[PDB]
Amino acid sequence: SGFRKMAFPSGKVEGCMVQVTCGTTTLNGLWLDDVVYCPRHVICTSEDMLNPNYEDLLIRKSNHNFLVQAGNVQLRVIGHSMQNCVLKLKVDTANPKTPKYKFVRIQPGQTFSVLACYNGSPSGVYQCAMRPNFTIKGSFLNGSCGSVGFNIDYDCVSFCYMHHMELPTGVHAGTDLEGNFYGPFVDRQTAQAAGTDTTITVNVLAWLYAAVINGDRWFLNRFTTTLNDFNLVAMKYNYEPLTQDHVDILGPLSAQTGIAVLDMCASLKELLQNGMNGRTILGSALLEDEFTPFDVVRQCSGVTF
Amino acid sequence: SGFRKMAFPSGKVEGCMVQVTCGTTTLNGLWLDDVVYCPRHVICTSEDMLNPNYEDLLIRKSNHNFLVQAGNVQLRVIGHSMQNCVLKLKVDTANPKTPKYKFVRIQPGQTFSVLACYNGSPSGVYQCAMRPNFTIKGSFLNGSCGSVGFNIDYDCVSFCYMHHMELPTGVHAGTDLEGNFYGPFVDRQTAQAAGTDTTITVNVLAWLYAAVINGDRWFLNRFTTTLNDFNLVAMKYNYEPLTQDHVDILGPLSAQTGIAVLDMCASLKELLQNGMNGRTILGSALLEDEFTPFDVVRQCSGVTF
Numbered sequence: 330s331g332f333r334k335m336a337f338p339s340g341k342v343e344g345c346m347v348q349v350t351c352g353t354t355t356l357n358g359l360w361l362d363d364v365v366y367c368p369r370h371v372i373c374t375s376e377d378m379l380n381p382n383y384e385d386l387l388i389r390k391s392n393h394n395f396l397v398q399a400g401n402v403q404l405r406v407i408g409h410s411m412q413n414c415v416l417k418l419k420v421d422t423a424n425p426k427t428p429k430y431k432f433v434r435i436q437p438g439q440t441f442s443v444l445a446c447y448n449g450s451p452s453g454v455y456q457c458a459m460r461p462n463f464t465i466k467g468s469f470l471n472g473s474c475g476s477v478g479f480n481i482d483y484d485c486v487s488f489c490y491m492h493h494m495e496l497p498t499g500v501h502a503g504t505d506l507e508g509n510f511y512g513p514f515v516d517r518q519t520a521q522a523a524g525t526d527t528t529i530t531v532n533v534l535a536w537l538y539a540a541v542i543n544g545d546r547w548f549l550n551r552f553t554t555t556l557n558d559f560n561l562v563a564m565k566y567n568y569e570p571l572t573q574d575h576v577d578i579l580g581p582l583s584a585q586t587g588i589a590v591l592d593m594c595a596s597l598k599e600l601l602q603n604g605m606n607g608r609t610i611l612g613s614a615l616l617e618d619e620f621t622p623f624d625v626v627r628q629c630s631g632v633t634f
Numbered sequence: 635s636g637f638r639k640m641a642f643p644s645g646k647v648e649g650c651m652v653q654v655t656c657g658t659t660t661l662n663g664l665w666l667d668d669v670v671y672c673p674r675h676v677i678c679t680s681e682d683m684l685n686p687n688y689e690d691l692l693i694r695k696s697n698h699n700f701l702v703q704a705g706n707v708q709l710r711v712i713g714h715s716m717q718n719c720v721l722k723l724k725v726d727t728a729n730p731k732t733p734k735y736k737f738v739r740i741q742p743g744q745t746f747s748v749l750a751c752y753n754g755s756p757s758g759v760y761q762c763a764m765r766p767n768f769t770i771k772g773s774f775l776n777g778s779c780g781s782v783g784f785n786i787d788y789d790c791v792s793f794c795y796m797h798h799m800e801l802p803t804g805v806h807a808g809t810d811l812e813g814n815f816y817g818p819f820v821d822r823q824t825a826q827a828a829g830t831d832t833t834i835t836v837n838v839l840a841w842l843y844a845a846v847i848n849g850d851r852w853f854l855n856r857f858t859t860t861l862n863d864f865n866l867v868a869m870k871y872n873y874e875p876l877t878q879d880h881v882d883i884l885g886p887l888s889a890q891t892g893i894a895v896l897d898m899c900a901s902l903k904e905l906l907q908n909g910m911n912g913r914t915i916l917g918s919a920l921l922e923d924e925f926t927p928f929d930v931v932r933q934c935s936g937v938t939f
């Protein structure tokens with residue numbers, strides 16, 4: 330019983346965090362086997378970001394220009410290259426704490442845990458959703474670049490995010506570990522701002538199920554609706570349209586609660602139309618959309634096994 | 635920028651989690667040096683919980699009745715004793731991973747991180763506050779007993795909580811690491827009820843400051859109030875009274891924003907009387923009270939350093 334915004338245990342990623350310094354510029358790197366990965370704008374100064382020529386700035390530095398430091402031991406760089414917006418430093422020692430890992434690209438609507446770091450030292454861990462507009466509402470301070478997002482499944486860490494930037498609204502942007510940004514953002518000092526966002530409908534439904542498993546049932550009605558009927562109200566409240574694939578994904582929770590998906594959509598329809606009657610759902614006065622159907626199962630389906 | 639419920643990194647506590655089995659009863663233990671700490675009702679069956687005499691139950695147990703598993707490695711028990719409501723199992727081998735640590739008893743109003751575990755295996759990490767009525771609002775499924783709560787400062791882990799039970803209301807109760815329960819609860823299957831919970835007034839104020847730093851200001855006003863007059867309004871809505879100690883603790887935040895504590899108080903008494911009316915603060919449509927002033931300072935106060 331109980332449902333909280335829960336991050337994955339962070340031990341496996343902590344032992345991979347290092348500090349990268351190139352000149353007066355420092356940030357965080359991820360040390361996996363004999364390579365350190367980090368945002369390429371560590372090779373820049375403040376003035377370089379007016380118009381950075383990364384191909385050129387890279388050729389001009391050599392291995393000795395990079396100081397990598399894991400805890401206090403200096404790691405010796407013996408190679409450097411660039412893949413998209415990520416820098417890769419080969420080092421002479423392989424990380425003995427390297428977990429089983431994969432590089433994945435997450436989709437909008439999906440969640441991950443962020444391990445926020447400064448000067449190579451983890452400071453906090455929390456859970457984020459990739460917004461429909463390819464930003465994340467993180468908590469980051471100066472020097473957090475290179476902090477990573479991940480999921481764990483079995484004993485395998487899937488790295489999906491590396492932190493590069495804060496945009497004007499104070500939301501955050503970054504890349505996958507291949508160095509491709511999520512969203513239409515770039516590592517240069519030029520005008521950028523997050524586009525229009527929408528509410529993640531399948532996640533709002535998963536969260537209402539979590540409530541029910543935990544005994545919150547006031548919002549339930551006896552009503553039901555059609556997928557088409559539901560998607561007309563969804564549009565009126567900036568909710569993205571519900572697909573049959575999303576209905577399938579909700580299978581496990583509908584099974585556990587005995588409430589069919591289109592039944593829970595009728596409940597959600599009434600909440601959007603008539604409000605939350607000054608009541609709370611799992612401790613929130615707002616409809617929450619940063620929990621995936623899998624995030625509910627992980628924390629809630631244990632009673633069913 | 636940004637503001638997010640943020641746990642401490644869990645790696646140092648992960649390395650201390652074990653599984654403790656007595657007969658057909660299993661739960662989690664904490665392995666520091668050559669002692670495993672766990673809830674004493676691991677030595678009970680469900681039938682013993684109706685009316686347990688823990689001192690007698692423990693006499694009938696030999697060292698071999700305790701099966702401690704650290705991953706897949708069995709640790710042989712060399713001794714068993716009881717301290718208040720925790721069992722201490724002496725084992726033949728010191729945990730090589732034991733961090734610098736301390737046992738502390740925390741105050742109601744304060745926060746800590748919970749590493750939720752099952753069968754000695756960490757599952758997730760989230761942030762909690764000890765409520766005024768000495769309960770915590772967690773996520774604790776079957777087999778979660780013995781999970782711990784902690785804070786980390788420097789390289790030192792301060793353990794403050796061990797989970798023992800869920801109350802019939804769905805909230806959670808346990809002990810410090812000397813085995814003394816927080817609150818008037820007991821490890822026996824009887825009727826016990828948490829007192830009426832109140833809102834943690836100093837925390838709500840600290841959060842309002844974080845909202846201002848973050849750019850939310852629709853709720854600020856030019857009117858002021860007195861600590862006595864604020865507290866009369868506060869009594870009528872189950873808000874705990876605000877003291878001069880609390881005003882001081884909010885000093886660093888008040889300075890950052892240059893907004894006096896008593897002006898924020900006037901804002902709060904305004905939100906308390908009428909309400910918000912469709913508007914939000916840091917993404918929430920409720921007044922949040924699970925962030926301490928320090929919590930806020932450590933995510934938001936980097937700007938001034």
Ligand SMILES: *CC(=O)[C@H](CCCNC(N)=O)NC(=O)[C@H](Cc1ccccc1)NC(=O)[C@@H](Cc1ccccc1)NC(=O)CCOCC#C
Pocket residue numbers: 353354355356370378471472473474475492493494495496497515516517518519520521
């Ligand atoms: C994230 C991090 O730790 C590093 C610091 C660089 C190294 N510094 C030192 N002292 O060693 N990165 C940053 O601080 C980023 C770098 C950057 C610059 C340009 C594009 C992309 C990334 N700076 C920001 O994220 C900054 C980005 C930005 C600049 C101009 C216009 C739009 C975005 N965001 C902020 O500075 C917070 C203010 O928001 C921007 C506005 C308005």
Ligand SMILES: *CC(=O)[C@H](CCCNC(N)=O)NC(=O)[C@H](Cc1ccccc1)NC(=O)[C@@H](Cc1ccccc1)NC(=O)CCOCC#C
Pocket residue numbers: 658659660661675683775776777778779780798799800801802820821822823824
């Ligand atoms: C927390 C945990 O993992 C272990 C399970 C031990 C058994 N493991 C085996 N066989 O492998 N501990 C528990 O579940 C606790 C034990 C307990 C019992 C009595 C007092 C204190 C602790 N059980 C609970 O926390 C339970 C206690 C309780 C029972 C009846 C009335 C009031 C409290 N709470 C709940 O089960 C949640 C709902 O219970 C009330 C209802 C309905």
